Amino acid sequence: TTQNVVLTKYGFDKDVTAIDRATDQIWTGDGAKPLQGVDFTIYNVTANYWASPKDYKGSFDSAPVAATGTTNDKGQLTQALPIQSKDASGKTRAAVYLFHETNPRAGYNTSADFWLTLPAKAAADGNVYVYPKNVQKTTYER
Ligand code: NA
């Protein structure tokens, strides 16, 4: 049993303000531009998550790759993801996936890593809609 995850990548726009967007609503981006040709790797982080849910902060170390994708013309990619997977003990668990932009990571329009805890609320068309946010900042330490 899988869900159909539709990812849409919109570039930063000074006039749209980046509130959260639920997985069961279509958001047109409010004029911001879809970003084409952005490569994402989707890691199955179910094991890393279930090692300790209360401590999970987005690590995908040693996580297997669930899928890769590249945004199209409309800034979108679609991927069916299993709603359950296995933890490190081999026990069946609700699945968690980490979306990581590998390319082009264009500065302030780089997507922040985000993770997704299935099953999610689906829209009427049956899709799960995610909208990666741009990174909080372009300076870093540590
Ligand atoms: Na696809």
User: CATH number, domain at 124?
Assistant: 2.60.40.10
**CA 90 from centroid of its chain's CA atoms:** 24
Q: Resolution limit in angstroms?
A: 2.0
CA of 5 to the centre of ligand 1 (A): 9
Structure determined by: X-ray
For residue 76, the enclosing domain spans 1-142
Closest CA to 42 of 81, 4, 3, 92: 81
Number of domains in the chain: 1
CA of 141 to the centre of ligand 1 (A): 35
User: Ligand 1 being an ion, which residues bring their Cβ within 5 A of it?
Assistant: 78
> What's the Cα-to-Cα distance from 40 to each of 63, 80, 115, 141, rounded to whole Å?
15, 14, 12, 24
Are 97 and 2 in contact, with CB atoms under 8 Å apart? Answer: no
Taken in order 54, 77, 131, 38, is the CA torsion positive or negative? positive
